[PDB]
A paper describes a structure:
[name] (CM) and cyclohexadienyl dehydratase (CDT) catalyze two subsequent reactions in the intracellular biosynthesis of l-phenylalanine (Phe). Here, we report the discovery of novel and extremely rare bifunctional fusion enzymes, consisting of fused CM and CDT domains, which are exported from the cytoplasm. In γ-proteobacterial fusion enzymes, the CM domain is N-terminal to the CDT domain, whereas the order is inverted in β-Proteobacteria. The fusion enzymes of Aequoribacter fuscus, Janthinobacterium sp. HH01, and [name] were crystallized and their structures refined to 1.6, 1.7, and 2.4 Å resolution, respectively.
To investigate the relative locations of the active sites within a single polypeptide, ∗AfCMCDT, ∗JbCDTCM, and ∗DsCDTCM were crystallized, and their structures solved and refined to 1.6, 1.7, and 2.4 Å resolution, respectively, and Rfree/Rwork values of 24.8/20.5%, 24.3/19.9%, and 25.8/23.0%. Also the structures of ∗DsCDTCM and ∗JbCDTCM are very similar, both overall and in the active site, with r.m.s.d = 1.4 Å (Cα atoms). ∗JbCDTCM and ∗DsCDTCM share the same residues in both CM and CDT active sites. In the two ∗CDTCMs, the distances between CM and CDT active sites are similarly large, measuring approximately 40 Å, thus disfavoring a direct intramolecular transfer of the metabolic intermediate prephenate from the CM to the CDT active site. Whereas ∗AfCMCDT and ∗JbCDTCM crystals contained only one polypeptide chain in the asymmetric unit, the ∗DsCDTCM crystal contained four chains; with head-to-tail dimers (CM-to-CDT) established by crystallographic symmetry. The buried surface area of this ∗DsCDTCM dimer was estimated to be 3070 Å2, with the free energy of dimer dissociation being 5.8 kcal/mol, as calculated using PDBePISA. The dimerization interface is mainly lined with hydrophilic and charged residues. The crystal structure of ∗DsCDTCM head-to-tail dimers allowed us to address possible intermolecular substrate channeling between domains of different protomers in a protein complex. The active sites of the CM and CDT domains of the two individual chains are separated by a substantial distance of about 40 Å and open toward opposite directions. An ATPase and another solute-binding protein are encoded directly downstream of the genes for ∗TaCMCDT and ∗TvCMCDT, whereas for ∗SbCMCDT and ∗SpCMCDT genes, no flanking coding regions with the same orientation were found. Interestingly, an intramembrane protease and an AI-2E family transporter are encoded by the two genes in the same direction and directly upstream of the one for ∗DsCDTCM, which suggests a role in signal recognition.
Numbering used by the authors:
A (entry chain C), B (entry chain D): 21 to 409
C (entry chain A): 20 to 376, 380 to 402
D (entry chain B): 20 to 376, 380 to 406
Amino acid sequence: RLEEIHARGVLRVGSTGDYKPFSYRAGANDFIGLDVEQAGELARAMGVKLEIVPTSWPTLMTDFGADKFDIVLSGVSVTAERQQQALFSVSYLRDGKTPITRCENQLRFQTLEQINQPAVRLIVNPGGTNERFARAHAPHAQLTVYPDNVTIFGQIVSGAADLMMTDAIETRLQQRLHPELCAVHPDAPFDTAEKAILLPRDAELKIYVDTWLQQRISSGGLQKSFDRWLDYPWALEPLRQAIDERLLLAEAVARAKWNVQAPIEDLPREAQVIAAAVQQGRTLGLPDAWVAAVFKAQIEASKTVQRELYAKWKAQQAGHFDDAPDLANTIRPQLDRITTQLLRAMADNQATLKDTARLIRPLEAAALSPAAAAQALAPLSAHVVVRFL
Amino acid sequence: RLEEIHARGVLRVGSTGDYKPFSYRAGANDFIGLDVEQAGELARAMGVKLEIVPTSWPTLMTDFGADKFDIVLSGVSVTAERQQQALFSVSYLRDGKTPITRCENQLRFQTLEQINQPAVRLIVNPGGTNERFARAHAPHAQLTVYPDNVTIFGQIVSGAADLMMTDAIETRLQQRLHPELCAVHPDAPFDTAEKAILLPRDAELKIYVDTWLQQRISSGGLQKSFDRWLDYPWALEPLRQAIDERLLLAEAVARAKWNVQAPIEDLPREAQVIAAAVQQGRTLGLPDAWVAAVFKAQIEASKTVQRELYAKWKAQQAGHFDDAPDLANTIRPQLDRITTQLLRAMADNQATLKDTARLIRPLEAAALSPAAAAQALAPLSAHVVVRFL
Amino acid sequence: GRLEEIHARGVLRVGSTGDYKPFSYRAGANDFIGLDVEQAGELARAMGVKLEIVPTSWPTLMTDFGADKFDIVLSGVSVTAERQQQALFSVSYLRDGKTPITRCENQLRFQTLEQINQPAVRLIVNPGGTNERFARAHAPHAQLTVYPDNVTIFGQIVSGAADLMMTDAIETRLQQRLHPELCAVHPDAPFDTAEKAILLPRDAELKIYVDTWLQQRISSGGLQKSFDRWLDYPWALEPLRQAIDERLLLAEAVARAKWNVQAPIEDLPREAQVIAAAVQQGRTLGLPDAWVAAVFKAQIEASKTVQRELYAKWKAQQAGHFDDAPDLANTIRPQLDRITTQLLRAMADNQATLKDTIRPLEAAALSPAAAAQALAPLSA
Amino acid sequence: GRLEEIHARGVLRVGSTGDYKPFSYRAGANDFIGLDVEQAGELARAMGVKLEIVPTSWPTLMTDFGADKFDIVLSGVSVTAERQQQALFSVSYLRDGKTPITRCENQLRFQTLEQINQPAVRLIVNPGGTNERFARAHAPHAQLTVYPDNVTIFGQIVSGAADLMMTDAIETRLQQRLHPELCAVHPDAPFDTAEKAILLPRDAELKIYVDTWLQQRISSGGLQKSFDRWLDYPWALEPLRQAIDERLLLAEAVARAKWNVQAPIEDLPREAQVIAAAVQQGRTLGLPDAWVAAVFKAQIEASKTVQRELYAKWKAQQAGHFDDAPDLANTIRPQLDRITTQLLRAMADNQATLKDTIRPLEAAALSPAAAAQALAPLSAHVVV
Ligand SMILES: [Cl-]
Ligand SMILES: [Cl-]
Ligand SMILES: [Cl-]
Ligand SMILES: [Cl-]
Ligand SMILES: [Cl-]
Ligand SMILES: [Cl-]
Ligand code: NA
Ligand code: NA
Ligand code: NA
Ligand code: NA
């Protein structure tokens, strides 16, 4: 197998994309997380390209049998069912299952006895170890099997189920994401399992991966990676998406203004944007001085992109952009939607935004203008956020 | 002393008003809580009126020495400094100090050793046992002293301090109020203290109070009171304040409209109120159908008050109300402020509003119109809140 | 159960340290006395069962609890959080806490925890305790010897071997009476507060039972009464009683030895010497002679009653020679003279206490008549 | 410390149950052997300190840990969450878990947990264990006897007293060799998974030390090697050795008794009868007589060497009469005949195993020469 990879020139890696902090699909061709980073390092070490292949827990082993990928790096628990068809690496992590529920009912679900009874509405994603564990250790409970995820933890928030039981590390993270949810004794889970790399029945590969892993572990490199991706501000990932998406749109804004040969400064639009942001921010209890600064920065950043393009296009004496979207009817609506998103992210994650060596990953739109990207983030640096509050 | 009370005809009771669930000043002449209810029962038993006298922890004993009140019922810990000047009753409760912090950092602050070091930002209210305990058992930490005890737990939510150490029962409550906060091992506090009634140096009174208390305890009456005031929806208390204050203003609205003999229906104002509420609600992620229903009800309730008054005043041939405030300039502004408050309370406490035998205390404005009061609350009954979500 | 498990087993097992007058004192044997032993009694009666005191100590307190060696603990136990981890408590029957005890000269040297907490000062505590925890927390700079017997620990202060101890203010009220040289430091204004309550296991129905019982006792004045009794109780007399007891138990050996040589029981020379020597020694302790003579006459007559009963028994059995019987002149009579000393010193301390004024001696097992004889001149 | 406290104290204290071949077996005495005893050894050497095995058991495992009876535990301990509460673990040196073992006829009767979990079936486990927890969780309906000795528990299945046991697949691979009548049930496909690792105390510097040590051992093939050694190790011979040992230690009593009557050491009648009776009994067990005779000749000659050494010692001391010396005819010789039985049965089981292939007997304390004599005809070459 190891030769087939070297020949094909590419490591195909299964990843569910549903399991923060291991493997998350933020969109696009944009997977992030611990096990995505590791897949990266392994590819580099073999001297080949990486390809993430999407999978899911229900489809995991059938996708393996169809040879859709070479390995799976996705916070996979070593289990015996899986050992039937597959090899595993040495473990890189030790975890296992603990409950997550609304913060009121933490005491209602301390024990498997408390949990295993017909009163209780249990929820799991399908295919999983999470499904197997719920069927084995809580049969009497009422089990809905809910075939989506990231939004499965919504079902508990909204009272539609009572609790879920999942890996204690998933639970530590989801309690940060949903403040209304709480992890149940995650330092003392109900059981133990290894996390390791799913491999095919090929011993030379297993030896390769294991040697690789043991090196990474002993040298501190995995420990480092674990620190990064747990202290990673998963909560700020929407905030980042909003700032990012808004800036990338400045390209379209420029195209449209260019066609009408509008000037870049549009003082009416600036006043409205800021005035409307402040109003919306007051309803969310944000202070106005700060909201204004934030949005001033967003505008100034946009305008830097615009100015760079206008310069370029004046030099070209460029003409008319044919599939440029409408400013009033398409674009400006999108921008106003994002303003909302951005303000809400500011409102929720005021604490998370004061931590300092817990820091966001870099914007896509530094590709477009690194200067503009800096401008946009400037008033969300911890020091100014503390300055305001 | 017991005779001086009977003579004066009034029991003067210290209460800090800062310590849910014992003693809270919701405004006004409006104290509520366990120890306010108890002060009530003691007054009744002596056959006298109750007067709450405001105090605070910093002023507690000086206010006692100035004979500003007879006793103090306010979740007061028995301590030796206080025993110097004062008697105590028998205990009605046994507690003591445990940390509260963001749900992430539960594990960071399990122990006093973990807590007592210069990295950590500790916060306490002044005057207290809480201040004395933090100075004695955690000197190396950074201690900000933040002189308002109701909004102090905001400072932790918002990352401005790391944790607070306070009575484990206060911590049980504040974790319910702020879902993002979590109590640290409140079943296993760092220490123990009695809660009891602060009394003056007079033995006949002490015997009276103690006999009273022992009766209340043995008969189940205190146990009952404890159940009530812990299951009391403290979270919904602002929501209730907003609905209440808004309805009480309908009295002013009627006075003003009466002077101009305006009609009660104003369909423009109705459309604007609802339209503006829905908009604001969208920014808070409330669903619009529900916000509209809620506010329809608030309007219909206002109009019921108006109609009752108009009828009354036609019968009286009442004249002109001289100090009636301006509708456009004074009143309608206030109403719009309260709309904001009300929406935010809806946004936060969607879960709390689905619990059913945890129910709010009755509105002040049932004095004005019980029918209107019913109308206003109707679309915040659990069944309709669940119907919408 | 738990309340049912007790009713079934037919016995209430109660922890008691036996080291903490006036709550719980082990005078020997199966012979516990004090406030909390009396209370354990009343609770047993109320449940309609027998009482069994189970010995414990402060260092072993909670491990003994976890091994289910007893049902409850009644022993002047402070409510503390460590103990609340494993256990329930009753309602408090007392509110107290820690205050210093020191020699009466140095009362003013140790008014405050600042005065106390410094490296000059020699502090002493019994181990296991709240007393140990409090000394470590509130006086770390002082020099701390940990002295593992709580009854004779107050001797160490008297004798200058430590400067002070810090303990429950009620313990301090008592020990200042027992050692006239020691004085309680502001016991009406202790350094802190604690509840005393009954340690219970994690069973709510029992807690409700005990609490209802206790609240009754408190509200009716019955606990207040019990407190008055057991503080005004003449604790001073307990060594005197131990000495009379030990001396009488030796009459068994005396008889064995005399039997082997078939000596007669009455020995008028020995009687005169014993009394004469007691009186002399008593004069040095300022005891009046008439009284010492009476006391020791009684002790002699009591011894002889034991002897006579045994001689009768042994004549009937035709018992032979007792092989491991100690020598009279060389082993036994020395021991008797040692105890005479102890007995006289106990008399000398408690001359006042013996105007005010009892359960049986251990040696009522041997001869109840002799035991009566021995106590007779400590009436009145 | 902790690593410093060990270096200071000069000794590594290691828990071992002594009940779990091939990891940890207590043959007696201060005589532990196995994979994890060998490893404990290597770790001690690496720290530059002496080893002390501290006995423990599964029921007492964690309480003994909390009482600080030892530093670490190396005993084929599964990583479990209960244990993680009080304790750290090393990296795993093995991945295993539970599979059935039963008589070779009933292999097909117990393929699945469904087949196993029902009231017809007589299940057996040792207590304290993961083995007990797993049987209670995954097979409640079965009849569960809890049999508190883990070495002879597999006898109960052989003898039909229970139907099967469920235990670590590696334990099952070994016990099927030891009892030919028993068979492992799909040990390449267990019902579940667990790590084996070293139980450590809450001290991170030590954990780093042990882990670095272990990762080296693993990556270099040294643990794989050690696994091969201790599975191919002739465990069958350990009872045989116990019987030779016990029999020789009795020669001390034999001498005491003969000394009191000043009997001579050589007794050619007794020799002929011992050998004659052993051969007869051996024929019923299908042992060949020539070999049994050799073995027992050696046992006799070895006994006599002990006797001679003691007689010499006692003549020099002019020792007198031994007062609590047992009777020869009535107490001792019976015991010797009981052990002969044991010894022959151990020979009968391990005829194959005695084509392969030792440490000292306990009775080298008594006479090293005699101990050599006793073992001499169980060198391969004499099994001609
Ligand atoms: Cl998994
Ligand atoms: Cl207080
Ligand atoms: Cl405490
Ligand atoms: Cl205590
Ligand atoms: Cl006295
Ligand atoms: Cl195990
Ligand atoms: Na010290
Ligand atoms: Na005194
Ligand atoms: Na053995
Ligand atoms: Na069963």
